[PDB]
């Protein structure tokens, strides 16, 4: 092939030649420049004024090769900075790519899917603009087959990823009608057997559940929670990660939505998640637990029954610090909403020592959270006349020294809560 390593000037000469074949060769040359891994000359191509020509080439139904080459070139310009994606949009590329979704050539429709994904992937405005130009119908139409397994694998993965970008980003979140339009195809993809399709389908579900209760409800109503819990149990980390993010988002919703997570068996997975060697999995699983322990007493009881309190003591005892912070939150929520017996159970599991040990941390917020937890636990002891026995417990593990020291802490609410503890239980 003689389209390798052209200068931009030669590409321009060829595209401006009025010779469809010369234009094709020059466009292919541009594609090859633009697809090189080391510093593709995107800005030089834009500056040469080539985007309008590429976009025009997208419409050449009689020359499918130049449709393809221009589609690939524009895809890679659009894969760049916001300014570069904006140059592609400003050239009129969105409707041209949407028109290419119906190409009889799979490699060309796939390229148009990819390009629209990059454009939508830029942010809420371009996502919403792609939707307004009517991208969703033809995209969904590409997946309207009896069995996803008959579609080419790379093709399906590209469609799934682009759809996930139509679900992605907030301020604002995607249009409600668009989410409703996309969800049933999404649910179908979530039941597919390809790991990459599953991963990106969950990411899309996690985006859709990252919002107000009404947004969570739209997803939960589709009955996907059992499938999410199943994926929560996958051996493939790229699958577990978004399944866990989705589930965590869902339990930030109402008690009833959280209950749907519990009913589907999610808690049985947490012994592994809370000891997972991947730090982000542990952190997100602990975050998720904190939102479940902020729930009703019967839900806290579900946490107990599944044996998850010892795992919370574990994470509080030893974990990356951010995971420990989430654990501290899980404990404060638990002690806030729990029955006396549930709080007593917490203490019997050994929560006090690691909670005290974390009071030496240089983080003011976790200090507040822990002091709040200790206050709640003391309240339960008061309701059992056992504050003395708690005081002794705290003093024996060096907790009292730390609380006493916190009175000299510069943060107001800290030396207040601490002075109060000292003056109320350690006199």
């Amino acid at each position: 092939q003689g389209t390798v390593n052209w200068s931009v000037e030669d590409i321009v000469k060829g595209i401006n030649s009025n010779n469809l074949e010369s234009q094709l060769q020059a466009t292919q040359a541009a594609r090859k420049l633009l697809s090189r891994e080391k510093q593709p000359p995107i800005d030089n191509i834009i500056r040469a004024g080539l985007i309008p020509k590429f976009v025009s080439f997208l419409g050449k139904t009689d020359c499918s090769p130049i449709q393809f080459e221009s589609a690939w070139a524009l895809t890679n310009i659009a894969s760049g900075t916001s300014e570069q994606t904006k140059a592609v949009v400003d050239g009129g590329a969105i409707p041209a790519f949407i028109s290419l979704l119906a190409s009889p050539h799979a490699h060309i429709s796939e390229q148009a899917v990819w390009a629209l994904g990059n454009i939508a992937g830029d942010g809420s405005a371009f996502r919403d603009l792609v939707i307004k130009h009517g991208a969703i119908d033809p995209l969904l139409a590409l997946l309207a087959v009896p069995d996803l397994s008959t579609l080419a694998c790379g093709y399906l993965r590209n469609l799934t990823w682009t759809l996930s970008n139509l679900c992605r980003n907030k301020n604002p979140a995607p249009p409600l009608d668009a989410v409703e339009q996309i969800l049933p195809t999404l649910v179908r993809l979530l039941h597919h057997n390809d790991p990459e399709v599953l991963a990106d389908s969950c990411w899309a579900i996690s985006y859709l559940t990252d919002g107000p209760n009404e947004r969570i409800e739209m997803v939960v109503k589709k009955g996907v929670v059992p499938q999410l819990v199943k994926l929560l149990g996958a051996t493939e980390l790229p699958i577990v990660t978004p399944a866990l993010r989705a589930i965590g988002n869902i339990v930030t919703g109402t008690d009833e939505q959280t209950q749907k997570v519990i009913d589907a068996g999610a808690l049985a997975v947490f012994p592994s998640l809370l000891t997972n060697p991947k730090t982000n999995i542990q952190k997100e699983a602990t975050w998720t637990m904190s939102n479940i322990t902020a729930g009703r007493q019967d839900q806290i009881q579900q946490v107990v029954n599944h044996g998850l309190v010892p795992f919370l003591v574990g994470v509080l005892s030893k974990a990356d610090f951010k995971t420990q912070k989430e654990a501290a939150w899980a404990i404060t929520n638990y002690t806030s909403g729990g029955t006396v017996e549930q709080i007593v159970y917490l203490v019997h599991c050994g929560i006090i020592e690691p909670l005290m040990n974390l009071l030496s941390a240089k983080d003011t917020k976790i200090i507040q959270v822990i002091l709040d937890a200790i206050s709640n636990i003391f309240q339960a002891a008061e309701k059992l006349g056992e504050t003395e026995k708690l005081s002794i417990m705290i003093e024996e593990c060096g907790g009292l020294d730390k609380i006493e020291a916190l009175q000299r802490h510069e943060n107001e609410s800290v030396y207040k809560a601490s002075l109060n503890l000292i003056e109320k239980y350690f006199s």
Binding site: S79, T85, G117, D122, A199, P242
Partner: peptide, 13 residues
């Protein structure tokens, strides 16, 4: 991070 990329470059094949 561990999320899908927002944009994808179709590299030299």
């Amino acid at each position: 991070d561990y999320m899908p990329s927002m944009k994808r470059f179709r590299k030299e094949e």
